[PDB]
């Protein structure tokens, strides 16, 4: 709000805090990103290396969705089981009856392997798996079941 602003404080001072020598004029450096390769190159390299020019290939009509594939790490995983149900399955770690987790149903695309789940057996249904995530899963007597 106007009342808290430093212009209210500048009233009575000649230059509104913009200097008597260098003034406040329309657009000294040029407008916008003018001169980026000339009188504004020092600020552009440093702060923004990589700005000018090209790398990589063009993809006409790239529709994301095609590439939809959220990741879930083992790290969590067990979070996809409601808490009440969760403790029930932790204790009684077994074949015969082991929880089924549709990670596609949780809206994940791929399982990655961030770190240690307990030694409970899990049946893990997913579209994709990192070599390790699946390794770790088996190492507790789970399997991964490949879906779509």
Partner 1 sequence: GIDHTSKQHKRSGHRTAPKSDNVYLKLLVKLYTFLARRTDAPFNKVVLKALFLSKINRPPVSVSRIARALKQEGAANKTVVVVGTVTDDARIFEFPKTTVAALRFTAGARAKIVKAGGECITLDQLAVRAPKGQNTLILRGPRNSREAVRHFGMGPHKGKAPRILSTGRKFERARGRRRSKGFKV
Binding site for Mg ion (CB under 5 A): 1-3, 12, 15, 17, 73, 75
Count residues near partner 1 (CB under 8 A): 20
CB-facing half-sphere around the CA of 87: CA atoms within 13 A: 2
Taking CB within 5 to 8 Å according to partner kind, which of Mg ion, RNA, partner 1, none is near residue 118? Answer: partner 1
Residues 6+ apart with CB under 8 A from 140: 93, 117, 118, 119, 120, 121, 122
- Which span (37-45, 82-90, 114-122, 139-147) binds RNA, by CB under 7 A? 114-122
Which residues are paired to 110 by β-bridges? Answer: 71, 128
State yes or no: residue 18 binds RNA (CB under 7 A).
yes
**Helix or strand (DSSP H, E) at 124:** strand 123-126
When computed from its CA atoms, the radius of gyration of the chain, rounded to whole angstroms, is 29
State yes or no: residue 116 binds RNA (CB under 7 A).
yes
Interface residues toward partner 1, by CB under 8 A: 45-56, 75-76, 78-79, 90, 115, 117-118
């Amino acid at each position: 709000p106007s009342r808290f602003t430093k212009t209210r404080k500048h009233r009575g001072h000649v230059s509104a805090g913009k200097g008597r020598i260098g003034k406040h004029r329309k657009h000294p450096g040029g407008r916008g990103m003018a001169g980026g390769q000339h009188h504004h190159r020092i600020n552009m390299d440093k702060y923004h290396p990589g700005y000018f020019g090209k790398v990589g290939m063009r993809y006409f009509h790239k529709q994301q969705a095609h590439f939809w594939k959220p990741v879930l790490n083992l790290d969590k995983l067990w979070t996809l089981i409601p808490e009440d149900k969760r403790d029930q399955y932790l204790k009684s770690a077994s074949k015969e009856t082991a929880p089924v987790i549709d990670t596609l149903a949780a809206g994940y695309g791929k399982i990655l392997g961030k770190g240690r789940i307990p030694n409970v057996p899990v049946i893990v249904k997913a579209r994709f798996v990192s070599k390790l995530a699946e390794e770790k899963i088996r190492a507790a007597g789970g399997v991964v079941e490949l879906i779509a």
